[PDB]
Amino acid sequence: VGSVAALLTVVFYIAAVMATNLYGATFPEWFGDLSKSLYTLFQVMTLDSWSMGIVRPVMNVHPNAWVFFIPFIMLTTFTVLNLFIGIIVD
Amino acid sequence: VGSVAALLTVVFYIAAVMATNLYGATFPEWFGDLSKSLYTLFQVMTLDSWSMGIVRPVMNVHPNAWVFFIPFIMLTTFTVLNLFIGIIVDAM
Amino acid sequence: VGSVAALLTVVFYIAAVMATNLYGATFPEWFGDLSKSLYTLFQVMTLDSWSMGIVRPVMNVHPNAWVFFIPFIMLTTFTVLNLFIGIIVD
Amino acid sequence: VGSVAALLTVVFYIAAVMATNLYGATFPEWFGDLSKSLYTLFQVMTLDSWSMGIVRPVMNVHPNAWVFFIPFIMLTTFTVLNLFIGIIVDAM
Ligand code: NA
Ligand code: NA
């Protein structure tokens, strides 16, 4: 359970280190520094306006941005569910 | 489990083949080619602005578009949940 | 399981018969007829722009509209989850 | 089960007492009184436009507003899921 959380935080930090680098210069209010990234990736992970509000405007400059966001969503949303179930079982 | 994923990908491809054909010419930014469709249907499956952002504008041109999106939502959202639970069970 | 679905459809029809009557004349594109209502209540049940997009503009004319939408959300979202789990178990 | 609901209502009231105080004067339509707060925190708990619609505009005046909303989300969303599962188990 704590092991699941450990994976998720490593993933969340690596995702935010990558996101800062990729879309930081072009989208500063969303990924203009590691912290700005960690917030936006938490927002993306919750699915609040992930596509219409973030990923589509991102794709208008970086057309393949989907190769990073969609897998990230698939991976982080599975982990969160897995974790939340793990606490409930334990 | 892998069988559940196999169903979902077939559904996802058939849904995107259908969606391209139906609302492609009228809504090119959303379904203007199989890939554009696969992205928008993933977005619809996650429920991000499915109605206010996609389905309602689509219905303003195709008033019965709901006969395709609502069942798709019902089917894909059930499958994803069923799949995610299936992995969790098959690990215990 | 089929019993759960039966409850939900009765609730969904009564909710749409009530919604048509309450906010139909004031918000025709959302509840201007039983079918328009059934669509918007499905949208509300999925939580797509339920508050910012629907319930807040509804409350600007009917300030207590929350006494209908919030319980409806609580009830329908519980039922859907209960149903989806029921199919998975059976 | 009823104990889980009891925790959530205490949390929900304390969160709305805090939220009223913090962002009430600056964002009156959202937290301008305990009731306005309880509605917006329910909306945040459901995740409807939590960030783009609420938290980001809030952060433009209070840059650390995230220290309150993100933990609240983490805590309330876990509780609701835990509660909904608890009813389902206590019926079997
Ligand atoms: Na949403
Ligand atoms: Na959601």
Author numbering:
A (entry chain B), C (entry chain B): 131 to 220
B (entry chain A), D (entry chain A): 131 to 222
How did the manuscript describe this experimental structure?
As with the eukaryotic channels, their S1–S4 segments form the voltage sensors, and the S5–S6 segments from each polypeptide chain associate to form an eight‐helix bundle that constitutes the pore. The selectivity filter (SF), which determines the channel's Na+ permeability over other cations, is formed by the close association of the P loops from each of the polypeptide chains.
This mutation changes the residue near the NaI site from a glutamic acid to the shorter aspartic acid, but does not alter the net charge of the SF. The crystal structure of the E178D mutant showed considerable differences from the wild‐type channel local to the site of the mutation: the methylene group of the glutamic acid was missing, producing a side chain that projected to a lesser extent into the SF, as expected, and the site at NaI was completely devoid of ordered electron density, suggesting that it was unoccupied by an ion. Soaking the crystals in calcium, which might have been expected to produce additional density if the SF had become calcium‐selective, produced a similar result: no density was seen in the region of the D178 residue (data not shown). Relative to wild‐type, the mutant has a more electropositive region (denoted by the circle in Fig 3B right) at the top of the SF, due to the exposure of the backbone nitrogen of residue S179 when the longer side chain of residue E178 is replaced with the shorter side chain in the mutant; this could tend to inhibit cations from binding at this site, consistent with measured decreased current densities. Sodium ions are shown as cyan spheres; only 2 are present in the mutant, instead of the 3 seen in the wild‐type, with the top sodium missing in the mutant. The current density of the E178D mutant channel was 15‐times less than that found in the wild‐type channel measured under sodium‐only conditions (11.4 ± 3 vs. 165 ± 21 pA/pF). As the structure demonstrates that there is one less binding site in the mutant channel than in the wild‐type structure, this could be consistent with fewer ions passing through the channel per unit of time, and therefore a lower current density. K+, Ca2+ and Ba2+ conductances were detected (albeit at lower levels) in addition to Na+ and Li+.
